[PDB]
Amino acid sequence: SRVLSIQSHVIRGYVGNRAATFPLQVLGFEIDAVNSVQFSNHTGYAHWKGQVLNSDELQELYEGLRLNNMNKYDYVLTGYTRDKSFLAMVVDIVQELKQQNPRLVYVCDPVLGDKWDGEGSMYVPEDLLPVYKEKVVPLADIITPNQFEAELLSGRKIHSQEEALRVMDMLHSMGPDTVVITSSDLPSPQGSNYLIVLGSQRRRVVMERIRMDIRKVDAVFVGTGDLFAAMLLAWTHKHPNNLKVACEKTVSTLHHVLQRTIQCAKAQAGEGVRPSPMQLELRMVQSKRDIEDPEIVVQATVL
Ligand SMILES: Nc1ncnc2c1ncn2[C@@H]1O[C@H](COP(=O)(O)OP(=O)(O)NP(=O)(O)O)[C@@H](O)[C@H]1O
Ligand SMILES: [Mg+2]
């Protein structure tokens, strides 16, 4: 199946299309990558340099595809975007691909910000929020917000597992049939060193709801949300009425990739020292085998 993925590209590193392309390619997807920017590296480094793609250029590329009658996709995948203009153009393109193919699954990662301590802080210009609420989310079939993004998109604050699942009911009714909170503050009965993933799916009307408790690792990675979105696309494709298994394969893939990265990062920086952003880049290529067939290392709680 064919996938149009519209996100950033970096030369060194694994974020946006870098984090989503190889893994989806490995899994047999015909993925076409629209590079929404081309930077030397991600913005977590001390320096970066590169160019952005403006919305007129995005339309040019899309016309290119239409003129050849190539504008027929089974999926669209979107992520981190800085310009409201660019985002609005993305909306028009999906509108049209959906008219071209009404069975198209739009996977949207509504990247807005994150809870970098306890207070959440926006990563993105504020005017993007309305476009997301009003234009993007109502179009999406799968969204993958973290906790902060779920709060923003819903208006409501999320402090418990039950608030989280009600906020997921709100987002369901905004459009998307699959909602997955990709990380949260929520407490785990297993320790402080945990991070909660919640998943919700509407199907032929039945609900499936899952929870996963995930052992935190003491480090900030980049591209892991992008990787989550891409793998959820891949795994819900293979297990379309099984959000439980699809989420277990997604998160296990993440474990294996991160495991390898942290083991590698510690070795590069020396026993004792905390590693740099460079040493923390996902060891993507080396995780080839775990992407093809991840060993399940977390079980999901049905909810
Ligand atoms: N220490 C860690 N740091 C970052 N990610 C982790 C860590 N441990 C596990 N993960 C995995 O990374 C996944 C996504 O989390 P994260 O990278 O915070 O994306 P997000 O903030 O949920 N969404 P986005 O706004 O696209 O970045 C989680 O579901 C975990 O599987
Ligand atoms: Mg995060």
| Sheet containing 50-52: order of strands | 50-52, 30-39, 2-10, 75-78, 105-108, 142-143, 178-181, 194-203, 206-215, 301-302
How far apart are alpha carbons 19 and 254 in whole angstroms?
Answer: 11
**How many independent structural domains does the chain possess?**
1
Choosing from 144, 183, 257 the residue with most ligand 1 atoms within 8 A of its CB, the one to mutate for a pocket test is: 183
List the beta bridge partners of residue 77.
5, 107
207 lines ligand 1 (CB under 6 A): no
- Among 78, 82, 101, CA closest to 90: 78
What values do phi and psi take at 14, rounded to 5?
-135, 85
Instruction: For the chain, give the longest Cα–Cα distance.
Output: 57
Atom of ligand 1 nearest to the CA of 251: 31
Which one is catalytic: 177, 226, 290, 293?
A: 226
CA 144 from chain centre, in angstroms, equals 6
- In whole angstroms, how large is the CA radius of gyration of the chain? 18
Structure tokens at 88: 């609005």
Q: Six-digit token pair at 243?
A: 């959000």
> What is d(CA 136, CA 31) in angstroms, rounded to the nearest whole number?
21
The two beta strands, 105-108 and 142-143, are parallel
Neighbours of 37 (CB within 10 A): 20
Q: Is 261 annotated as a binding residue?
A: no
The β-bridge relationship of strands 75-78 and 105-108 is parallel
Ligand 1 contact via 16 beta carbon (within 6 Å): no
Question: Which residue's entry shows tokens 């709801």?
Answer: 209
Neighbours of 207 (CB within 10 A): 14
Q: Which residue in this structure is represented by tokens 């920017």?
A: 37
Element (H, E) at 116: none
Q: In the structure, how many helices (H) and strands (E) does the chain have?
A: 9, 12
CB-CB contact of 115 with 150 (8 Å):
no
Strand pairing report for 206-215 and 105-108: unpaired
Indicate which residue's Cα is closest to atom 1 of ligand 1.
Answer: 217
Q: What residue type is 106 in one-letter code?
A: Y
The one-letter amino acid code at 51 reads Q
Question: What is the C-alpha separation between 142 and 282, in angstroms, rounded?
Answer: 24
Structural resolution in Å: 2.5
Structural domain including 242 reads 1-303
Confirm or deny that 43 is annotated as ligand binding: yes
How far does residue 146's CA lie from ligand 2's centre (Å)? 6
Measuring CA to CA, which residue among 253, 256, 250, 223 is closest to residue 237?
A: 250
Is 114 marked within a binding site?
Answer: yes
Single-letter code of the amino acid located at 46:
A
Ligand 1, residue 217: give the atom nearest the CA. 1
The residues near 267 (Cβ < 8 Å, ≥ 6 apart) are none
217 is in an annotated binding site: yes
The amino acid occupying position 226 is D
What does the block give as tokens for 196?
A: 């909660």
CATH of residue 111's domain is: 3.40.1190.20
Give the whole-angstrom CA distance, residue 58 versus residue 127: 20
Residues 6+ apart with CB under 8 A from 24: 3, 5, 31, 230, 233, 234
> Which DSSP string corresponds to 9-59?
EESSS-STHHHHHHHHHHTT-EEEEEEEEEESS-TTSS---EEE--HHHHH
Q: Which ligand is nearest to the CA of 109?
A: 1
Structural contact between residues 222 and 277, judged by C-beta atoms closer than 8 angstroms? yes
Beta bridge partners of 31: 3
83 labelled catalytic: no
Distance CA 87, CA 79 (A): 10
| 63 alpha carbon – ligand 2 mean position (Å) | 35
Residues 6+ apart with CB under 8 A from 231: 23, 249, 250, 253, 254, 291
Q: Where are the beta strands (DSSP E) in 123-266?
A: 142-143, 178-181, 194-203, 206-215
103: tokens are 């069975």
